[PDB]
Enzyme design. Structure first.
Site, short mmCIF file in Angstrom:
data_model
loop_
_atom_site.label_atom_id
_atom_site.label_comp_id
_atom_site.label_asym_id
_atom_site.label_seq_id
_atom_site.Cartn_x
_atom_site.Cartn_y
_atom_site.Cartn_z
N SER A 1 -75.00 9.00 34.50
CA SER A 1 -73.96 9.64 35.35
C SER A 1 -73.16 10.68 34.58
CB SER A 1 -72.98 8.61 35.96
OG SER A 1 -71.85 9.25 36.54
N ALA B 1 -72.45 15.00 34.14
CA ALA B 1 -72.64 16.46 34.29
C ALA B 1 -73.93 16.86 35.03
CB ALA B 1 -72.58 17.12 32.90
N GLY C 1 -74.32 14.86 38.50
CA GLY C 1 -74.15 13.93 39.61
C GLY C 1 -74.27 12.52 39.07
N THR C 2 -75.01 11.65 39.76
CA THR C 2 -75.21 10.28 39.29
C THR C 2 -76.65 9.86 39.48
OG1 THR C 2 -73.06 9.90 40.27
CG2 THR C 2 -74.25 7.92 39.45
N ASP D 1 -88.25 23.42 28.11
CA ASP D 1 -87.29 22.48 27.57
C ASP D 1 -87.90 21.17 27.04
OD1 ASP D 1 -84.84 21.61 26.75
OD2 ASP D 1 -84.14 21.06 28.74
N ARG E 1 -85.72 14.20 24.09
CA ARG E 1 -84.78 13.74 25.14
C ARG E 1 -85.45 13.83 26.50
NH1 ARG E 1 -83.26 19.28 26.03
NH2 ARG E 1 -83.17 19.80 23.77
N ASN E 2 -86.39 14.76 26.65
CA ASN E 2 -87.03 14.95 27.93
C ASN E 2 -88.40 14.31 28.07
OD1 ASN E 2 -84.81 16.38 28.88
ND2 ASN E 2 -85.68 18.39 28.20
N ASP F 1 -87.86 16.39 33.07
CA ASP F 1 -86.89 17.49 33.13
C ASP F 1 -87.47 18.86 33.38
OD1 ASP F 1 -84.42 19.27 32.23
OD2 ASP F 1 -83.71 17.23 32.53
C1 LIG Z 1 -77.93 9.67 28.05
N1 LIG Z 1 -78.89 8.60 28.43
C2 LIG Z 1 -78.86 8.31 29.89
C3 LIG Z 1 -79.58 6.96 30.28
C4 LIG Z 1 -79.90 7.03 31.79
O1 LIG Z 1 -79.03 7.75 32.51
C5 LIG Z 1 -79.33 9.17 32.26
C6 LIG Z 1 -78.12 9.91 32.86
C7 LIG Z 1 -79.33 9.57 30.73
O2 LIG Z 1 -80.53 10.39 30.26
C8 LIG Z 1 -80.37 11.84 30.52
N2 LIG Z 1 -80.65 9.50 33.07
C9 LIG Z 1 -80.93 10.71 33.65
C10 LIG Z 1 -80.27 11.95 33.71
C11 LIG Z 1 -80.82 13.03 34.39
C12 LIG Z 1 -82.04 12.93 35.05
C13 LIG Z 1 -82.71 11.72 35.00
C14 LIG Z 1 -82.16 10.62 34.31
C15 LIG Z 1 -82.61 9.32 34.11
C16 LIG Z 1 -83.76 8.64 34.53
C17 LIG Z 1 -84.02 7.31 34.19
C18 LIG Z 1 -83.04 6.62 33.40
C19 LIG Z 1 -82.86 5.33 32.85
C20 LIG Z 1 -81.64 5.31 32.16
N3 LIG Z 1 -81.07 6.54 32.26
C21 LIG Z 1 -81.88 7.31 33.00
C22 LIG Z 1 -81.66 8.66 33.35
C23 LIG Z 1 -81.13 4.05 31.43
C24 LIG Z 1 -82.27 3.05 31.13
C25 LIG Z 1 -83.20 2.81 32.35
C26 LIG Z 1 -83.81 4.10 32.94
C27 LIG Z 1 -85.26 7.02 34.79
O3 LIG Z 1 -85.87 5.95 34.75
N4 LIG Z 1 -85.79 8.06 35.45
C28 LIG Z 1 -84.90 9.20 35.35
#
Ligand SMILES: CN[C@@H]1C[C@H]2O[C@@](C)([C@@H]1OC)n1c3ccccc3c3c4c(c5c6c(n2c5c31)CCCC6)C(=O)N=C4
Length: 300
Positions: free
Chosen positions: A25, A27, A29-30, A142, A146-147, A160
């Protein structure tokens, strides 16, 4: 660049899926973890639902839609599967749940348990995602640890697509405008001319591999982004990670050659790391070496 793109975009009913937790969640949305329970299909698909942010700028929606566009036109075991969009006030991107989170965090969090075998397999798997992207004439722009998300410790997928650009009728390079780019992962031709090619993606691959081998170090940890173009022009690159035989390191270095055509092709990267993945310990020296659920990969 002349083949019609006939991928299907799937529009989802808000009531076909339930949110469960809240994963990330901020920068953008969520992101929620949840389940997609289509129609009356007797299946439940663990998904990640990303929603707009709220406060809807015509700027935001135009992008998540581009991403959706890109993500719907790829189908590969090593690229993230986009399930559909849901057209609520706030647009939601629905994709496959990657339970183990992203690879960057996963190497950090698991240093003491990552064997050479995993590392080389990851390298091969990413090389495959990218080589498939190269077939689809697609430039990720990119690529970084991280991606890459982790579906299981043995299966990673590239993610990403908020920068990915599809190469129009036989272009070679993409001439990008201004706007933020992660400097420490970019080919030099990209920093100085904003040219992006499949080969500039190789460069970022080289850095991704280096992030993996140093268990998640930050490239140019000290240097601030402003200096980079110079430093690289000096002919300087990243240090050889401790666990790395010269064989592995030599490959990183090749991805970082100035003459973009001198760097290797993803199809070659696949071959090289896969030869090495047959004898992992020769190339990496590591001390110690509910009921109706279906994964999105089985839902076709
Ligand atoms: C910083 N670290 C975070 C851990 C997490 O929140 C974030 C926001 C972060 O990373 C970018 N995030 C996303 C941010 C932007 C796009 C996609 C995601 C995202 C995804 C998933 C995530 C999971 C977890 N984050 C998942 C994901 C936490 C662990 C279970 C899976 C997933 O399965 N598909 C997409």
């Amino acid at each position: 660049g002349e083949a019609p793109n006939q991928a299907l975009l799937r529009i989802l009913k808000e009531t076909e899926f339930k949110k469960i937790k809240v994963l990330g969640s901020g920068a953008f949305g969520t992101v929620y973890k949840g389940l997609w329970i289509p129609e009356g299909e007797k299946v439940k698909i663990p998904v990640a639902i990303k929603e707009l942010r709220e406060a809807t700028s015509p700027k935001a929606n135009k992008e998540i839609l581009d991403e959706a566009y890109v993500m719907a036109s790829v189908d590969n075991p090593h690229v993230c599967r986009l399930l559909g969009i849901c057209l609520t006030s706030t647009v939601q991107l629905i994709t496959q749940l990657m339970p183990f989170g992203c690879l960057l965090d996963y190497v950090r969090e698991h240093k003491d348990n990552i064997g050479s075998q995993y590392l080389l397999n990851w390298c091969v798997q990413i090389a495959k995602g990218m080589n498939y992207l190269e077939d689809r004439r697609l430039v990720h722009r990119d690529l970084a640890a991280r991606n890459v998300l982790v579906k299981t410790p043995q299966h990673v997928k590239i993610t990403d697509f908020g920068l990915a650009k599809l190469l129009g009728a036989e272009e070679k390079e993409y001439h990008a405008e201004g706007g933020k780019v992660p400097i420490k992962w970019m080919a030099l031709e990209s920093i100085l001319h904003r040219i992006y090619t499949h080969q500039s993606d190789v460069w970022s691959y080289g850095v991704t591999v280096w992030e993996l081998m140093t268990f998640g170090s930050k490239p140019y940890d000290g240097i601030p982004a402003s200096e980079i173009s110079s430093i690289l022009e000096k002919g300087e690159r990243l240090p050889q990670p401790p666990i790395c035989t010269i064989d592995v390191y030599m490959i990183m270095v090749k991805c970082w050659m100035i003459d973009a055509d001198s760097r290797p092709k993803f199809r070659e990267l696949i071959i090289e790391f896969s030869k090495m993945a047959r004898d992992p310990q020769r190339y990496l020296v590591i001390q110690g070496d509910m009921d109706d659920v279906v994964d999105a990969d089985e839902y076709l």
